[PDB]
């Protein structure tokens, strides 16, 4: 099954900047996110379809996560990817999709929508703690991109 969740968020950073820095996540994320050590392309140019392998360290053990770039839409300031391999996918989870879409906010900032789509196998529903972790991870990546923009204003 597919179980979709949406959270609304806010940022002081304008949406064009945030969108441009989302597309630089491969380089931003391992600097800012401690446990993210590297992101390499397995196949593709970085566009929709691209498979990426992330190396992380959790509890001082090296682990690997697989991401697929799903879609990137400048007209909706939208950047979308899926976890398709590694720790976040227990046996009844087939894939977890993270979408981020941005609109113009008040005061030169942004309103964000974070969508999490949790694809289960068969009639399985998503586990509630998994959901909770999925949501935290999604919000974390967003704040990492945001934090980077805020701390490095001349780059965007």
The CA distance from 138 to 116, in Å, is: 8
Q: Work out how close the CB of 152 gets to Na ion at its nearest, in angstroms, rounded to a whole number.
A: 16
Among 13, 25, 28, 36, binds Na ion (CB under 5 A): 36
Which CB sits closer to Na ion, 29 or 110?
Answer: 29
Per-residue DSSP letters for the chain? -EEEEEEEEEESS-HHHHHHHHTTHHHHHHHHSTTEEEEEEEESSSSTT-EEEEEEEETTEEEEEEEEEEEEEGGGTEEEEEEEESTT--TTEEEEEEEEEEEE-GGG-EEEEEEEEEEESTTPPPPHHHHHHHHHHHHHHHHHHHHHHHH-GGG-
Residue 145, Cα to own-chain centre: how many angstroms?
A: 10
Q: Taking contact as CB under 5 A, which single stretch among the options 2-10, 30-38, 84-92, 121-129 is the one that binds Na ion?
A: 30-38
Here the tokens at position 13 are 């950073």
Q: Work out how close the CB of 58 gets to Na ion at its nearest, in angstroms, rounded to a whole number.
A: 12
**Is position 25 an interface residue for Na ion (rule: CB under 5 A)?**
no
Q: Work out how close the CB of 148 gets to Na ion at its nearest, in angstroms, rounded to a whole number.
A: 12
Q: Work out how close the CB of 54 gets to Na ion at its nearest, in angstroms, rounded to a whole number.
A: 10
Which CB sits closer to Na ion, 30 or 134?
Answer: 30
Q: Work out how close the CB of 141 gets to Na ion at its nearest, in angstroms, rounded to a whole number.
A: 12
Which CB sits closer to Na ion, 36 or 116?
Answer: 36
Among 30, 126, 134, 138, binds Na ion (CB under 5 A): 30
Q: Where does this chain bind Na ion (CB under 5 A)?
A: 30, 34, 36
């Amino acid at each position: 099954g597919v179980f979709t969740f949406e959270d609304e968020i806010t940022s002081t950073v304008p949406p064009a900047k945030l969108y441009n820095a989302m597309k630089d996540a491969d380089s931003i994320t391992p600097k800012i996110i401690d446990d993210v050590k590297s992101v390499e392309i397995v196949e593709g140019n970085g566009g929709p379809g691209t498979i990426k392998k992330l190396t992380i360290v959790e509890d001082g053990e090296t682990k690997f996560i697989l991401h697929k770039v799903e879609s990137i839409d400048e007209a909706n300031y939208a950047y979308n990817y899926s976890v398709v391999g590694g720790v976040a996918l227990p046996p009844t989870a087939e894939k977890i999709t993270f979408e981020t879409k941005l609109v113009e906010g008040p005061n030169g900032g942004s309103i964000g929508k974070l969508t999490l789509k949790y694809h289960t196998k068969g009639d399985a529903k998503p586990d509630e703690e998994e959901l909770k972790k999925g949501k935290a991870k999604g919000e974390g990546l967003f704040r990492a991109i945001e934090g980077y923009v805020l701390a490095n204003p001349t780059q965007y």
